[PDB]
Design a binder for this molecule. Structure first.
Ligand SMILES: Cc1cn([C@H]2C[C@H](O)[C@@H](COP(=O)(O)O)O2)c(=O)[nH]c1=O
Ligand SMILES: Cc1cn([C@H]2C[C@H](O)[C@@H](COP(=O)(O)O)O2)c(=O)[nH]c1=O
Ligand SMILES: [Mg+2]
Lengths: 196, 204
């Protein structure tokens, strides 16, 4: 089973990955985790990270350019993902393909049913071969709470809010597959039971 | 012996590659050729090509984004190149790193002294460890004639770089500066009527 944990910056994804992993383990299942972007493991990820901090000229000014970089980072992880899927009962990803759909659409002021979100699906799942997640878990957070709890994306308050809005719609519309929306207080045991 | 052939679109680089290949094989040296972008062998290359034709939204609007894709395409070729440099006396590349420096600078209205060319240097050679070419051969041709070739060899489609006559002229000018200053190593500037056999003896 492949599970992707999604959310805006400051959502608390790392902590949820930890709790959920612990719940599946207590339930008698092996669990492996992987986080994106894979900083320090792929040039694409590192260049994207640098671009978000002002490096590489006009690269970050392009929505599709940035999305392509994150997608190429994931492309180089296909072999790893397939390996984990063959060796573990549950593979939990901290950010996956939906991240690209949400942030790209938000930057273009588009919605979940927009062009960028559709493009992400056509490119990553079909052309790059990224496995579709069985479940995409959105750790939803309001803009106010997020704004409460420094690259180009992090500093852009408007972008974060719009990205949260796109995510909420990607989840409701079942983009890429089935979604579940949870809070940072979700009970690990019940969530794991629901995602079993 | 790593040899890279450079030049604007429609310069006739393919034709020169062949001639140089045969000439080298005559002198008793084995040769392998590889062209960039590696269409069909790299997703980075295929997306770059489609982007040059208007696909993928605003991708092509970013000069550095396009340079990066071509740079990533080559990075995924580092092992294939090293390999060739192992199984053949001479390796001839149709376009290489200098192509990125020339077009990027040209798109930004910069020259060999601009940030873009220096950027391509750091990223491709200093960071991605792409093998420095022994020789970079600039096939200098008439801008009018090169543009006509592209138009003809397609109208019988042209991408965004090919249809930009001013871009092609500037790219030709940047190339001359790169060759003149020995950017990335030693260069050799030749014409369309260059004698194959003589060129080979010169290079090797
Ligand atoms: C993995 C991924 C991240 N991003 C973003 C969201 C973050 O602001 C930034 C780096 O992610 P991070 O904060 O989880 O390390 O890049 C995308 O836009 N698309 C993607 O596919
Ligand atoms: C290989 C390469 C090509 N280009 C260009 C020049 C061409 O107009 C276009 C596609 O190359 P092509 O005419 O050899 O098929 O992309 C770059 O800008 N950087 C590169 O590194
Ligand atoms: Mg061409």
């Amino acid at each position: 089973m492949l599970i992707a944990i999604e959310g805006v910056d400051g959502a608390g994804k790392r902590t949820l990955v930890e709790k959920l992993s612990g719940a599946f383990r207590a339930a008698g299942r092996s669990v492996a985790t992987l986080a994106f972007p894979r900083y320090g493991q792929s040039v694409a990820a590192d260049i994207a990270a640098e671009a978000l901090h002002g490096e590489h000229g006009d690269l970050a000014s392009s929505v599709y350019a940035m999305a392509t970089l994150f997608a190429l980072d994931r492309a180089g992880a296909v072999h790893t993902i397939q390996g984990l899927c063959r060796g573990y009962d549950v593979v939990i990803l901290d950010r996956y393909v939906a991240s690209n759909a949400a942030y790209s659409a938000a930057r273009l002021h588009e919605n979940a049913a927009g062009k960028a979100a559709a493009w992400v699906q056509r490119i990553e799942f079909a052309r790059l071969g990224l496995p579709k997640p069985d479940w995409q878990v959105l750790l939803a957070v309001s803009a106010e709470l997020a704004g409460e709890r420094r690259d180009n994306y992090e500093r852009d308050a408007e972008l974060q809010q719009r990205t949260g809005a796109v995510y909420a719609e990607l989840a409701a519309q079942g983009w890429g597959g089935r979604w579940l929306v949870v809070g940072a207080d979700v009970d690990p045991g019940r969530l794991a039971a629901t995602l079993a």
